Amino acid sequence: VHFKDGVYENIPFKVKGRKTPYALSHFGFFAIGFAVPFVACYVQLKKSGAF
Template sequence: MFSRAIQRQTRQTTRLFSTASKQLNHHGPSGPYSNLFKVHNRRIPYAVPHTLFFVLGFGIPFFACWVQLKRSGSL
């Protein structure tokens, strides 16, 4: 009983790899992820709002700390 279960399990996990039937092209111009970072027809490049978002996001807490320390007289 257990030997049949083990044999059945080993048969199911055996995979045959073959690359002759299909050519894999990971660096081609087409595919589902080919336009992931290409944003066309924009007046402002995508890097500008992206950079401003992170500068403001990381800068506001530091500015708030500086204002509070300045008010308390620690600076």
């Protein structure tokens, strides 16, 4: 398929024309990744009665 060229069309995510700020998507993409081991820690500590 012929796809669009340009500067922002090579990324799966939207940066420029958005109704929400981009830093929402950007930093919530990485805070979820930083927060998977904390969800892991929480459920394996609630399973072991420490909470």
